[PDB]
Amino acid sequence: STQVCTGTDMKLRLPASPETHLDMLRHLYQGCQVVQGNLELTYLPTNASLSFLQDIQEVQGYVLIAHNQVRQVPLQRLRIVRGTQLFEDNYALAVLDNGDPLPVTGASPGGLRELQLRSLTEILKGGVLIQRNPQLCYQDTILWKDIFHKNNQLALTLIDTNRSRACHPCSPMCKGSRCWGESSEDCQSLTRTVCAGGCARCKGPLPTDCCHEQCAAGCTGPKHSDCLACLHFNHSGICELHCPALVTYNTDTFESMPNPEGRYTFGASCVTACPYNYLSTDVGSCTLVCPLHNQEVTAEDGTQKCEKCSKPCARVCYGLGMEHLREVRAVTSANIQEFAGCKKIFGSLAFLPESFDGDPASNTAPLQPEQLQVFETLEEITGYLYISAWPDSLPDLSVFQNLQVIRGRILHNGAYSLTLQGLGISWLGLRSLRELGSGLALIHHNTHLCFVHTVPWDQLFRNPHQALLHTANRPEDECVGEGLACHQLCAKGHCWGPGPTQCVND
Numbered sequence: 001s002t003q004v005c006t007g008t009d010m011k012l013r014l015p016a017s018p019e020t021h022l023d024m025l026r027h028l029y030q031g032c033q034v035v036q037g038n039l040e041l042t043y044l045p046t047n048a049s050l051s052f053l054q055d056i057q058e059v060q061g062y063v064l065i066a067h068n069q070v071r072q073v074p075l076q077r078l079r080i081v082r083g084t085q086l087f088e089d090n091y092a093l094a095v096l097d098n099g100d101p102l103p104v105t106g107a108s109p110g111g112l113r114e115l116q117l118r119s120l121t122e123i124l125k126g127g128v129l130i131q132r133n134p135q136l137c138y139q140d141t142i143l144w145k146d147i148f149h150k151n152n153q154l155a156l157t158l159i160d161t162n163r164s165r166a167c168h169p170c171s172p173m174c175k176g177s178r179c180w181g182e183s184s185e186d187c188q189s190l191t192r193t194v195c196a197g198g199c200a201r202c203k204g205p206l207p208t209d210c211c212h213e214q215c216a217a218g219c220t221g222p223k224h225s226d227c228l229a230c231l232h233f234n235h236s237g238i239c240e241l242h243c244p245a246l247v248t249y250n251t252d253t254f255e256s257m258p259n260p261e262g263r264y265t266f267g268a269s270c271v272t273a274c275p276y277n278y279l280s281t282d283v284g285s286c287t288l289v290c291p292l293h294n295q296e297v298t299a300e301d302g303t304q305k306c307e308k309c310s311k312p313c314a315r316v317c318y319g320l321g322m323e324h325l326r327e328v329r330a331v332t333s334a335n336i337q338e339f340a341g342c343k344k345i346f347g348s349l350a351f352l353p354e355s356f357d358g359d360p361a362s363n364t365a366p367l368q369p370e371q372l373q374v375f376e377t378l379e380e381i382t383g384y385l386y387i388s389a390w391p392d393s394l395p396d397l398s399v400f401q402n403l404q405v406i407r408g409r410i411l412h413n414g415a416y417s418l419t420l421q422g423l424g425i426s427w428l429g430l431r432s433l434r435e436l437g438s439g440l441a442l443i444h445h446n447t448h449l450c451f452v453h454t455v456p457w458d459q460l461f462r463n464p465h466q467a468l469l470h471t472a473n474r475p476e477d478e479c480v481g482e483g484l485a486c487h488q489l490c491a492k493g494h495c496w497g498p499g500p501t502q503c504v505n506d
């Protein structure tokens with residue numbers, strides 16, 4: 001079971017499916033406490049209920065809140081933003097264009113009114129960017145320097161105050177007129193700028209109130225167990241600079257010996273075993289991508305480790321986002337052949353309009369339906385599969401009929417492992433697909449698409465945060481109306497298409 005979830009990576013990109021965007025976020029963050037990656041709350045309408053964000057305590061990446069009409073984003077328990085990643089490379093926190101502009105009295109103007117990040121006492125790396133927020137107050141009465149960590153090398157700020165309404169003053173309870181909102185419970189609590197000795201964080205003014213060095217954001221007691229957050233690692237209750245290595249060395253021989261107290265690194269914590277879908281490494285870490293020349297090794301049970309493949313190392317098929325294809329945003333005639341005979345692909349596959357439109361300027365001839373037969377041997381994709389264009393002549397995605405797993409170690413917009421949109425396909429035909437390691441599935445605006453409801457999607461997912469988002473595909477009544485359905489021989493009514501070849505799970 002998990003208290004950890006993953007953020008997204010969409011930046012300011014428009015959600016392709018406004019009708020399911022919120023449902024995605026909800027699935028993504030509900031019950032979540034620690035957000036690996038980034039917390040991006042964008043393009044939300046004024047009627048958006050965001051209560052599912054109430055348990056978020058820390059965000060490993062950055063926090064983006066932009067282009068929303070909603071009036072409040074309940075992040076009252078967000079204690080720390082590590083900023084392992086930054087918006088525009090500088091900000092750990094970015095609040096942009098949240099308000100309609102850039103029968104009045106009736107409808108209360110849309111837009112964020114107050115931040116209310118009353119628990120946010122720590123930004124390890126990165127700055128604060130707040131711009132064009134018409135109904136926003138108090139952002140200027142906050143002592144950001146206190147929030148920024150001492151070692152924060154990017155304690156930069158860019159706060160806009162041009163408001164479009166008048167602000168009521170902070171509650172009388174707030175000491176130096178510093179608050180996140182009008183409430184008496186929004187007084188900014190300082191934990192750095194008001195400390196004794198020279199300690200980074202503290203509970204009060206007294207030298208005894210100082211927090212343990214390994215703490216971050218704050219503390220209740222003076223012990224390294226009274227931290228509100230761990231600056232580096234939570235080791236089963238105590239914050240430490242590093243975890244216990246997996247091996248102990250011999251004093252004279254210096255020969256490895258397993259360590260009963262050994263733990264891998266996963267986010268800001270020391271764990272005994274890496275969680276599902278992650279890779280265990282030589283260096284005792286939990287990662288989605290292996291070391292220099294080290295490569296994946298699938299054990300029977302599924303636990304894929306990373307072994308030394310420094311010197312003797314068999315070549316593999318890298319996909320989009322990896323190695324030379326790291327910046328390529330689509331499969332084209334210029335790279336299609338690189339996948340010939342690839343059983344497994346380390347990276348992702350994405351097909352866009354241009355893929356089949358071809359780019360005459362680069363003399364990259366359009367991709368041909370027959371060229372797609374290159375993936376017929378493909379059984380695994382460690383990344384994601386994105387398809388926003390497909391040849392009308394082809395009725396399904398049978399070229400991927402032997403695709404068994406899509407780990408989703410890398411997600412589109414950091415959220416979706418499988419995306420099918422604007423296509424002309426009549427059915428999926430992904431007959432061998434038995435798993436989506438992580439990420440959500442998005443299938444929408446596929447007019448002639450049936451056999452979506454016939455797929456046992458729940459069987460493919462592996463964690464509580466996954467689900468299928470779908471809308472605007474061929475109506476189920478029309479499919480059934482045309483008499484379409486799983487072949488009589490399909491055991492439990494489950495199939496990926498029309499024929500007998502499309503049935504599922506016995």
Ligand SMILES: *[C@@H]1O[C@H](CO)[C@@H](O[C@@H]2O[C@H](CO)[C@@H](O)[C@H](O)[C@H]2NC(C)=O)[C@H](O)[C@H]1NC(C)=O
Pocket residue numbers: 227228229230234235236237238
């Ligand atoms: C470090 O991790 C431990 C878990 O090992 C956290 O302790 C949990 O705290 C919550 C709320 O205080 C309790 O509901 C759990 O029962 C605790 N689990 C255990 C076994 O201790 C601890 O809060 C974490 N410390 C920090 C600062 O992140």
Ligand SMILES: *[C@@H]1O[C@H](CO)[C@@H](O)[C@H](O)[C@H]1NC(C)=O
Pocket residue numbers: 045047048
């Ligand atoms: C939110 O706005 C959309 C705009 O299309 C509307 O369809 C929907 O009913 C609204 N939801 C609520 C909570 O009223």
Ligand SMILES: *[C@@H]1O[C@H](CO)[C@@H](O)[C@H](O)[C@H]1NC(C)=O
Pocket residue numbers: 131132160162
């Ligand atoms: C605030 O308003 C002033 C005057 O209207 C304008 O010059 C300035 O660019 C605005 N700040 C921002 C960055 O929105």
